[PDB]
C-alpha cells in the first residue's frame, strides 16, 4: 500500500499550508509575554539552556584563527528577548530581533531594560517572509522556531540567512529534534523533525556543518534539543 511506516517531510503532515501558518500566528498571540510563555511551561530550564548556548557559541567568538565577530547578531523567533537578554546582548555590541508576534517585541522593550537600548531593529515578520540584510550579521541565532516553517520555507530562509553573514559569521539552529520522522503538533501548529530531515534541509540551503551538540540536563519527558553551527 501507499501509507509509509512514518512521515519524513512536512508535505506529508501539513494539510493546508495557509492554515498551518494562520493557526500558529493565532496560537502565539494568546501566549503570555513571559519567559515561561516562551518556553511552554519550562521557564525553570532557561538558565540551563542559556549557559549551554553560551559555551557552544563562545568557541566561535574566542578560539581559532578565523574568529566570528561580535559586532551584530540577529535573534530569530526572538519572542520577548529571553535569548537576546542573557546570551546575545552580553556578547554582541548590537542585536536585531525578528518575530511574528508584535506584542512580544513590544514587551521586549520592557523585558530587556537598559541593555535593550542596544537592540537596534525590531522586525515584526514571519521568517518565511523575512530577508535578513546581506553582509549584516556575525551570528544569526534561530531557536525554538524552525518547526513553524515548512520544509521549503525553512530551506529558503536558511539560504537567505547565509547571504546575510559577515566574514567568519555563523548561523546557529537550536531546536527540538524528533527521534524519527516528522511529527505534527496540531495545537501550536508546528512540526518536529528528526536529525536526518534537518540535515537534509541544511544541505539544501547550501550550508556546511561546523558543530552539532545535543543539549544536556533537560527534562526527561521532552524532545531532545540540538544545536547546529552552520555557514
Amino acid at each position: 500500500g501507499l501509507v509509509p511506516r512514518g512521515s519524513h517531510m512536512t508535505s506529508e503532515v501539513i494539510e493546508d499550508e495557509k492554515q498551518f501558518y494562520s493557526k500558529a500566528k493565532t496560537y502565539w498571540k494568546q501566549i503570555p509575554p513571559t519567559v515561561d510563555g516562551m518556553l511552554g511551561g519550562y521557564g525553570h530550564i532557561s538558565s540551563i539552556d542559556i549557559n549551554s548556548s553560551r559555551k557552544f557559541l563562545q568557541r566561535f567568538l574566542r578560539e581559532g584563527p578565523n574568529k566570528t565577530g561580535t559586532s551584530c547578531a540577529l535573534d530569530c523567533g526572538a519572542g520577548i528577548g529571553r535569548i537576546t537578554k542573557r546570551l546575545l546582548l552580553p556578547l554582541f555590541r548590537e542585536v536585531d530581533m525578528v518575530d511574528i508576534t508584535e506584542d512580544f517585541l513590544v514587551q521586549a522593550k520592557t523585558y530587556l531594560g537598559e541593555e535593550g537600548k542596544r537592540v537596534r531593529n525590531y522586525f515584526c515578520c514571519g521568517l518565511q517572509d523575512f530577508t535578513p540584510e546581506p553582509d549584516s550579521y556575525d551570528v544569526i541565532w534561530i531557536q525554538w522556531v524552525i518547526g513553524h516553517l515548512t520544509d521549503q520555507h525553512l530551506a529558503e530562509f536558511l539560504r537567505r540567512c547565509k547571504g546575510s553573514l559577515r566574514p567568519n559569521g555563523i548561523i546557529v539552529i537550536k531546536d527540538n529534534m524528533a527521534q524519527e520522522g516528522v511529527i505534527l503538533d496540531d495545537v501550536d501548529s508546528s512540526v518536529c523533525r528528526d536529525l536526518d530531515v534537518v540535515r537534509r534541509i541544511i544541505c539544501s540551503a547550501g550550508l556546511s556543518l561546523l558543530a552539532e551538540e545535543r543539549q544536556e540536563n533537560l527534562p526527561d519527558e521532552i524532545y531532545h534539543v540540538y544545536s547546529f553551527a552552520l555557514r
Binding site: 525554538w144 527540538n176 503538533d185 518536529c192 533537560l218 527534562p219 519527558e221 524532545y223
Partner: peptide, 6 residues
C-alpha cells in the same frame, strides 16, 4: 519551546 514528546 521545549515540548513533551508526543
Amino acid at each position: 519551546x521545549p515540548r513533551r514528546r508526543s
